[PDB]
Amino acid sequence: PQITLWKRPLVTIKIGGQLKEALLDTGADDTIIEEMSLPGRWKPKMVGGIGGFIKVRQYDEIIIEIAGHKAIGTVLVGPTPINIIGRNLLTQIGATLNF
C-alpha cells in the first residue's frame, strides 16, 4: 500500500502468536514491542530517545508478520509506550519513503 502521513501509520502485526497494532517508524533503528513473552535467549539492552532511555530485552531471530508481509529479525521487548516497527524489519518488507 501507499500510506499517507496525515495520521500515525499504524498497521496490524502478528508476533508470538498475538495480533497487535504497531507504528511503522522510519526514525527507529530497531523494532520494539510492549512487554510480552518470546522464546529463546535474550540479552539486556538500553535504547533511548526523547525523554531518555529504557531497558529492554533483545531477542534475535524473531518472525513477525507486518500487514501481511513476513520478516525475521531482532525484536526488543520492554516498556515502550507504543509498539514500533523499525528499520531492521521495514527493510525486509520493502518499505520506502517517497516524495
Ligand X SMILES: CC(C)CN(C[C@@H](O)[C@H](Cc1ccccc1)NC(=O)O[C@H]1CCOC1)S(=O)(=O)c1ccc(N)cc1
Contact status: 44 vs its own copies (CB under 8 A) = no
Contact status: 12 vs its own copies (CB under 8 A) = no
Measured CA to CA in angstroms, residue 78 lies from 4, 57, 81, 86 at distances of 28, 6, 9, 15
Contact set for ligand X, span 27-56 (CB under 6 A): 27-30, 32, 47-50
Q: Residue 6 touches which of its own copies, ligand X, none (CB < 5 to 8 A by kind)?
A: its own copies
CA 91 and chain centroid, separation: 12
Contact status: 86 vs ligand X (CB under 6 A) = yes
Burial 15-54 (b: 16+ CB within 10 A, else e): bbeeeeebbbbeebebbbbeeeeeeeeeeebebeeeeeeb
Please give the size of the binding site for ligand X, defined by CB under 6 A: 15
Figure out which of the listed residues 17, 40, 81, 94 binds ligand X, where binding follows CB under 6 A: 81
Q: Which residues are catalytic?
A: 25
